[PDB]
Amino acid sequence: LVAPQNTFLENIVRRSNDTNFVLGNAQIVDWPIVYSNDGFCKLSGYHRAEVMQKSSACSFMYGELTDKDTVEKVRQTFENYEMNSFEILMYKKNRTPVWFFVKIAPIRNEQDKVVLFLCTFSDITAFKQPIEDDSCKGWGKFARLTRALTSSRGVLQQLAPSVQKGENVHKHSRLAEVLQLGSDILPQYKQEAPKTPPHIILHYCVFKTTWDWIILILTFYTAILVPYNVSFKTRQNNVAWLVVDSIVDVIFLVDIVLNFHTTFVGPAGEVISDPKLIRMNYLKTWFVIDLLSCLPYDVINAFENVDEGISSLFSSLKVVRLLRLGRVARKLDHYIEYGAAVLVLLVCVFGLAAHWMACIWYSIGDYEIFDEDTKTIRNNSWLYQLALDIGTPYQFNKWEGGPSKNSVYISSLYFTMTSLTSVGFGNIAPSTDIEKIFAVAIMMIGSLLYATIFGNVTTIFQQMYANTNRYHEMLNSVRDFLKLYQVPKGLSERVMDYIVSTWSMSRGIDTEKVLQICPKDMRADICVHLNRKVFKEHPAFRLASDGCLRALAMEFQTVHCAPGDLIYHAGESVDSLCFVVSGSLEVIQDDEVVAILGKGDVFGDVFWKEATLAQSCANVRALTYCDLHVIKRDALQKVLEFYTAFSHSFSRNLILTYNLRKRIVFRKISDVKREEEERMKRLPPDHPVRRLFQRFRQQKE
């Protein structure tokens, strides 16, 4: 998790080393200043706000002793863009002249251009010719001039008083710090990315992902095989297994070597890629135990071995991965995503634990069967009972071999496996004291791991089935509510269809919440993207600035209307302009169609001109599955009055397709036909209602 980062200011202030600097623009005439520094504003007495937007030729602290030659030199250096360093008499706020040195260094840009200048400053008043304009005394002016040379008199040239004729090196020492500014110019005012150092590879790379699986399977294989080899007294009649062990060991050696040149996630940070400390962290974390883990004791044992038991500790030596990789195998928890991979992990660890405890059961039995010099058969031991039951019992002339190692291994495996899973068949029995205590330990640990499996699997089931129950409960509650208040079917069907459709489409996601999660800039950009159709298609928005576009986009709300639903009823107040982006809409008046609406059409009223609310004169009904983009009247009015220049064109360019306030008058064909029929088949004393009609007409006039 890293971002392209601009490290201009930080590098320049770190490299300054108690100096000063002033920044200026490069593609701009006369070069106004873009930045100043505390050291400068303290030495020159000019505040930062009053130096801003000043010529970078430094004309504003010129004076009588300034040389026009130096002015031409700084001008040709600025216009030719070259490194250089001058000394020239400058003037402070009190117009007192003080000896001065300067050096300029423009900086390039990632786009192959020069954008910013950089001019550094220094005082050499105490080491130059003494010049005074108006002072109480010569020594007083000298002390005043020397008092401003603290930076030069500091550790930069602290050895000057102890020596003589040090001027031959003071200038070089002063210029050495300034000359380093090229290193700070490397970013070139650009989003310099944190490039990886050479011969170090990211740990998220494809090669490392495919290397992690192979090291996992190899460590799994070794963890299985080693105890069987070490305890079951197997011989080395097969040489190929030594070749396999050698290639296995060299693979682990390659892995431990590769772990040097690989970045790791810092626990106190995010990503650390500094080779001066990556290797140190690895060696202080896991490298020594991994080395003492990764020595071929058995391969050396092919010639000679210092100890026989070293190959036994070689097991737990290889097991250090099981934690080094196993806890990092939470990165293996990346995609096996159908149920938690912790389940595969627990079943695998159950298997390997069963193998381990089968091995140690065999070890116990072999340690128990014989009585050494006592020559006692010790018949109550489990292995002798198994030998009697399996057939081919022991005999003596020396003693017979009895059972073969293959059957003994699997029988011990069953004992362990029936012990761990707590079925306890009862054919092969612990019968002596140490088998007794072993059964104790095995049954304890098996019960614990059994409980762990159950807890994990139950958590999975409850997490998978959580959402379905809540949705069904909400639906049932809605159904009960509609049943209670005697709602007719014609409306209950509509409400349940709406609920089921909106749940199927939107799922368990809130658009408003997702919007409010993001910050203001991302929110505005998302709004622009969501509403981009209406801006880019409707000609009324082709003169929109970014600010007005964003202020409008923040407000627009989208509406999905099903077929048959109505938007604006007759008699309702109209207060929202709305653009049609999909489907088609119709307007019905007095049970007659007067207009039909399609894509890229808007209908409403001129709020900014009428400046008053009005009654809707007709109903608008949905035909097809349509999408609407609605704007409220108050917010639109506020935005348009804020953006007067935009409104002067918005009012002229925006034309409504149909005005809800305005309504048409008309007649019907059947009505005029029946009127004609009635007139073919064709009040004198109606004086009061005649006067009524006259009064009504006069009032209407």
- Within residues 409-448, the interface with a copy of itself by CB under 8 A covers 410-411, 413-414, 417-419, 421-427, 429-431, 433, 436-437, 439-440, 443-444, 447-448
Q: Which stretch binds a copy of itself (CB under 8 A): 56-64, 87-95, 177-185, 494-502?
A: 494-502
Contact of 554 with 527, CB cutoff 8 Å? yes
Residues between 620 and 649 with contacts to a copy of itself, criterion CB under 8 A: 623-625, 642
Closer Cβ to a copy of itself, 297 or 568, answer by number? 568
Residues between 58 and 87 with contacts to a copy of itself, criterion CB under 8 A: none
Residue from 253, 475, 595, 654 in contact with a copy of itself (CB under 8 A)? 595
Residue from 216, 526, 588, 606 in contact with a copy of itself (CB under 8 A)? 526
CA distance 136 to 211: 82
Q: What number of residues does the chain have? A: 701
Residues between 306 and 345 with contacts to a copy of itself, criterion CB under 8 A: 340
Q: How far is the CB of 82 from a copy of itself (least distance, A)?
A: 17
CA distance 25 to 30: 9
- Does residue 41 bind a copy of itself (CB under 8 A)? no
* Distances, alpha carbon 658 to alpha carbons 119, 265, 396, 578, 665, in Å: 65, 63, 114, 11, 15
Bridging pattern class, strands 658-659 and 601-604: parallel
- CB neighbourhood size of 199 (10 A): 8
- Does residue 516 bind a copy of itself (CB under 8 A)? no
* Residues touching a copy of itself, count (CB under 8 A): 146
Q: How far is the CB of 339 from a copy of itself (least distance, A)?
A: 11
Q: How far is the CB of 661 from a copy of itself (least distance, A)?
A: 14
Residue from 508, 684, 685, 688 in contact with a copy of itself (CB under 8 A)? 508
Burial class (CB in 10 A: 0-12, 13-18, 19+), 169: middle
Q: Is 656 helix (H, G, I), strand (E, B) or coil?
A: coil
Q: Which stretch binds a copy of itself (CB under 8 A): 117-125, 273-281, 403-411, 685-693?
A: 403-411
Q: Which residue has the tokens 């490392």?
A: 208
Q: How far is the CB of 610 from a copy of itself (least distance, A)?
A: 16
Cα torsion 155, 157, 159, 162: sign: negative
Q: How far is the CB of 632 from a copy of itself (least distance, A)?
A: 14
Q: How far is the CB of 589 from a copy of itself (least distance, A)?
A: 11
> In sequence order, which residues have a C-beta less than 8 Å from that of residue 183 and are 6 or more positions away?
11, 15
CA distance 556 to 524: 11
- CB neighbourhood size of 693 (10 A): 11
Q: Which residue has the tokens 């070089």?
A: 172
- Does residue 240 bind a copy of itself (CB under 8 A)? no
Contact of 2 with 194, CB cutoff 8 Å? yes
Residue from 67, 110, 307, 389 in contact with a copy of itself (CB under 8 A)? 389
CA distance 637 to 629: 17
Residue from 161, 267, 269, 519 in contact with a copy of itself (CB under 8 A)? 519
Q: How far is the CB of 181 from a copy of itself (least distance, A)?
A: 17
Residue from 207, 399, 481, 696 in contact with a copy of itself (CB under 8 A)? 481
Closer Cβ to a copy of itself, 326 or 351, answer by number? 351
Q: Is 485 helix (H, G, I), strand (E, B) or coil?
A: coil
Q: How far is the CB of 63 from a copy of itself (least distance, A)?
A: 27
Residue from 209, 395, 459, 694 in contact with a copy of itself (CB under 8 A)? 459
Instruction: Give the distance, in angstroms, between the CA of residue 567 and the centroid of all CA atoms in the same chain.
Output: 41
- Does residue 5 bind a copy of itself (CB under 8 A)? yes
Helix boundaries (H) for 507-624: 511-517, 520-530, 532-537, 546-553, 607-610
Per-residue mark of binding to a copy of itself, 252-281 (x: CB under 8 A): ------------------------------
Closer Cβ to a copy of itself, 152 or 419, answer by number? 419
CA distance 383 to 408: 8
Burial class (CB in 10 A: 0-12, 13-18, 19+), 233: exposed
Contact of 560 with 624, CB cutoff 8 Å? no
> In which element (H, E) is residue 689 found?
helix 687-700
Tally of CA atoms within 13 A in the half-sphere of 61 that contains its CB = 23
Residue from 218, 242, 499, 654 in contact with a copy of itself (CB under 8 A)? 499
- Does residue 592 bind a copy of itself (CB under 8 A)? yes
Q: Which stretch binds a copy of itself (CB under 8 A): 84-92, 129-137, 260-268, 540-548?
A: 540-548
Q: Which residue has the tokens 């600097």?
A: 21
Q: Which stretch binds a copy of itself (CB under 8 A): 28-36, 127-135, 169-177, 300-308?
A: 28-36
> In sequence order, which residues have a C-beta less than 8 Å from that of residue 656 and are 6 or more positions away?
602, 603, 604, 605, 606
Residue from 3, 306, 611, 665 in contact with a copy of itself (CB under 8 A)? 3
Closer Cβ to a copy of itself, 251 or 630, answer by number? 630
Q: Which stretch binds a copy of itself (CB under 8 A): 90-98, 239-247, 512-520, 681-689?
A: 512-520
CA distance 229 to 298: 11
Q: How far is the CB of 35 from a copy of itself (least distance, A)?
A: 5
